[PDB]
Amino acid sequence: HGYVESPASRAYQCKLQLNTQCGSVQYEPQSVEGLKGFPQAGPADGHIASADKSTFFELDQQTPTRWNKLNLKTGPNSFTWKLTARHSTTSWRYFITKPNWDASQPLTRASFDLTPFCQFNDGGAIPAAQVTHQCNIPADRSGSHVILAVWDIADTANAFYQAIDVNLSK
Ligand SMILES: [Cu+2]
Numbered sequence: 663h664g665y666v667e668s669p670a671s672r673a674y675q676c677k678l679q680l681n682t683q684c685g686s687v688q689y690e691p692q693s694v695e696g697l698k699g700f701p702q703a704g705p706a707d708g709h710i711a712s713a714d715k716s717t718f719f720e721l722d723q724q725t726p727t728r729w730n731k732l733n734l735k736t737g738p739n740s741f742t743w744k745l746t747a748r749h750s751t752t753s754w755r756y757f758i759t760k761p762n763w764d765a766s767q768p769l770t771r772a773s774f775d776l777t778p779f780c781q782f783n784d785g786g787a788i789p790a791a792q793v794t795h796q797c798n799i800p801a802d803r804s805g806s807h808v809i810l811a812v813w814d815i816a817d818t819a820n821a822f823y824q825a826i827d828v829n830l831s832k
Contacts, residue, residue, distance in 0.1 A: 664745035698821035
């Protein structure tokens with residue numbers, strides 16, 4: 663269990679009350695857990711941000727103004743997870759929406775570039791309670807986008823899904 667605390671994920675911003683009417687996830691942003699195997703398997707289209715758990719379906723809403731967006735620059739960024747339970751880990755992956763994705767429609771695999779812009783494969787090692795990855799957000803993205811951070815667990819069928827709402831500039 664864990665969440666991306668910086669830049670604050672959509673679920674974490676629900677706990678901080680930067681996002682409103684998120685439902686149960688406000689009280690458990692670390693628990694956005696579904697099956698691993700994304701994108702070949704994993705949470706169904708339209709239900710990625712919720713990890714396809716019905717109680718988190720508020721996170722599957724998508725309008726241009728629904729979610730509070732962090733104003734980030736492209737290029738070097740840092741993504742920091744807070745882990746409330748440090749599970750044997752397969753990988754951490756970071757995906758970003760395609761340049762011409764539609765912020766008014768549900769998030770699907772077609773919304774995202776399915777090649778993650780960076781990936782860290784831990785080989786089952788136990789991570790620390792705070793994990794930070796440094797990657798370059800692609801420069802060809804501008805304006806409103808969603809970054810999907812995915813944590814694949816090595817010794818279960820599960821993964822944690824952390825959508826992050828961003829507004830990108832040079
Ligand atoms: Cu856990």
